[PDB]
Design a protein around this ligand. Structure first.
Ligand SMILES: [Mg+2]
Ligand SMILES: [Mg+2]
Ligand SMILES: [Mg+2]
Ligand SMILES: [Mg+2]
Ligand SMILES: [Mg+2]
Ligand SMILES: [Mg+2]
Length: 295
DNA sequence: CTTTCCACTTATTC
DNA sequence: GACCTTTTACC
DNA sequence: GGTAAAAGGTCGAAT
DNA sequence: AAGTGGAAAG
């Protein structure tokens, strides 16, 4: 079983709540609904979804194209398990707001209100604040429903278990091989990083104080912006970052990448990265980790 | 009528 | 998220 | 004068 | 991450 806090961290990173309000000619109100929670991952981490499915005892696993796989929970009684978990081990990113909306929709459907037009309208109001908001057809059918900005969620990191889950989803353990004017001509630089949308700037900034190291990079692509929490000082990587995830085990393929990363850290600690033999081993490690891995 | 699941695509936050 | 080169800091 | 740390990104694809 | 169409089932 996956640790509940690690699960919530991973959910904060990768999870999503869904509310389908579909035009249905066979429905009494002309609309049918579907409520749920889902995680879609690369095929290589199917084992994560299976473990979550085994832990919660709910949800359906299915292919999501040829390179991805999804765990979806939409069966209404099973949603109580979802609610139970996140009431006890709450999300802390802006996704908490999505969960709260998911919970509101559940209440409407529990009382069977969604089978009446007033319940549908209420669900539309809920959906308008959920994820990417209303669709064009729903906006046209319910013009009185106005896109109101959501309030900001501001929660602190609850513990290192949550962080392990979150890092399992968003983190990167990287070995940078820098062309250098040194004896060996190559500088070995370990980099730890966590990426997140700027909507959770407060959470990302807190990482600096929560981990006692690192800095924030502000990145952008066209009109989109995100943040990168980065650590490049080796003493911080060795004495702070590595012990955290040694004690709080990562999940998925990324665990293997972290362990290869630690192999390099050990060589750097022993100053072997300044020898031909050590550099050779490091180059071989780098080639087989992250995107170099083969499945 | 209503719920549930399967197949599959697309935009962008990793 | 994984990856890169160039630049700057440090002793 | 040699080594480490930071800067400042790019872009393909797993969310 | 977030969405769509389709349809089996009682
Ligand atoms: Mg995420
Ligand atoms: Mg991930
Ligand atoms: Mg994305
Ligand atoms: Mg994402
Ligand atoms: Mg990856
Ligand atoms: Mg990803």
């Amino acid at each position: 079983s996956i640790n509940p806090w690690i699960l919530t961290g991973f959910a904060d990173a990768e999870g999503s709540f869904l509310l389908r309000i579909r035009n249905n000619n066979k429905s009494s109100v002309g609309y049918s609904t579907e409520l749920g929670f889902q995680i879609t991952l690369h095929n290589k981490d199917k084992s994560i979804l299976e473990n979550i499915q085994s832990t919660w005892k709910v949800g359906v696993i299915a292919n999501s194209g040829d390179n991805a796989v999804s765990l979806k929970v939409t069966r209404f009684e099973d949603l109580k398990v979802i609610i139970d978990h996140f009431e006890k081990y709450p999300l802390i990113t802006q996704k908490l707001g999505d969960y709260m909306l998911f919970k509101q929709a559940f209440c409407v459907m529990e009382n069977k209100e969604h089978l009446k037009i007033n319940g549908i309208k209420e669900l539309v109001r809920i959906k308008a604040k959920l994820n990417w908001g209303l669709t064009d057809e729903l906006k046209f059918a319910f013009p009185e429903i106005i896109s109101k900005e959501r309030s900001l969620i501001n929660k602190n990191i609850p513990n290192f278990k949550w962080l392990a889950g979150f890092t399992s989803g968003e983190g990167c353990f990287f070995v940078n091989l820098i062309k250098s004017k040194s004896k060996l001509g190559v500088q070995v630089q370990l980099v730890f990083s966590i990426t997140q949308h700027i909507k959770d700037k407060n959470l990302m900034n807190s990482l600096i104080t929560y981990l006692g190291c690192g800095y924030i990079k502000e990145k952008n692509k066209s009109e989109f912006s995100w943040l990168d929490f980065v650590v490049t000082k080796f003493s911080d990587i060795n004495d702070k970052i590595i012990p955290v995830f040694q004690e709080n085990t990562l999940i998925g393929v990324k665990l293997e990448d972290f362990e290869d990363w630690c192999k390099v850290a050990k060589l750097i600690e022993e100053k072997k990265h300044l020898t031909e033999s050590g550099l050779d081993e490091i180059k071989k490690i780098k080639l087989n980790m992250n995107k170099g891995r083969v499945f």
